[PDB]
Amino acid sequence: GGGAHIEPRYRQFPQLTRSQVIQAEFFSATMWFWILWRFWHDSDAVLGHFPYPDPSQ
């Protein structure tokens, strides 16, 4: 037929290709590195604060 290139599993938990996961894991950085600049430099709110308009005079 087509080919044998991988056999199935009886729940012996098949093996990976070893370039399958590493090539992916470099994209586990792109969320954890690109999350860098969140708190640097930005705070929970970069706003300025309303100073309670006391001068009703």
Residue from 13, 17, 18, 27 binding other proteins (CB under 8 A): 27
- Residue 12: left if φ>0, alpha if ψ -120 to 50, beta else—which one? alpha
Residue 30 in contact with other proteins, rule: CB under 8 A? yes
In angstroms, what is the minimal distance from the CB of 2 to other proteins?
17
Query: Which residues lie closer than 8 Å to 4 by C-beta, 6 or more apart?
Result: none
In the block, which residue shows the tokens 């999350």? Answer: 35
Residue 56 in contact with other proteins, rule: CB under 8 A? yes
Applying CB under 8 A, which part among 5-13, 14-22, 29-37 lies near other proteins? 29-37
